[PDB]
Amino acid sequence: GSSGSSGSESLVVCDVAEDLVEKLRKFRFRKETHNAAIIMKIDKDERLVVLDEELEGVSPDELKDELPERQPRFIVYSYKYQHDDGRVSYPLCFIFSSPVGCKPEQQMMYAGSKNKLVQTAELTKVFEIRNTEDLTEEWLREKLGSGPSSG
Fold this sequence. Notes:
The PDB classes it as hormone/growth factor. The entry lists the keywords actin binding protein, cytoskeleton, RIKEN Structural Genomics/Proteomics Initiative, rsgi, Structural Genomics, hormone-growth factor complex. This protein is α/β, with parallel strands linked by helices. The protein has one domain (about 1-150): 3-Layer(aba) Sandwich (Severin). It is built from 4 helices and 8 strands; from the N terminus they run E-H-E-E-H-E-E-E-E-H-E-H. Strand 7, helix 3 and strand 8 form a beta-alpha-beta unit. The longest helix has 19 residues, at about 105-120. The termini are far apart.
């Protein structure tokens, strides 16, 4: 199909609900050992990012399952990067689950809104997947291994 779409110049940003933020804050300063996953979504009337659900001791391969494969959703997972020496830390990263089968009118909302989130949860690593399926164990260590670069 040879279509030359132009598109509209307008972004839809929102704020993070205190009810959710609180959770994000703890995530980083979590006193647990197992893994975790915090999902977030935006409403049409609430026009504010609220807590969707909280997962515990989950995996990067099973988490994607609890995520939509048609619409973009927010999910904050914390992988476990073990170090040969013996020490192991859980680096908090933001996985922007955006299914290719999603519409642009929505991508703009979650897109502009996402950024803000990365600031609320104080996340340094931010990865995005074109399909919830991609979100897997291997793919996980992949992002932590080779992330963004400056130049």
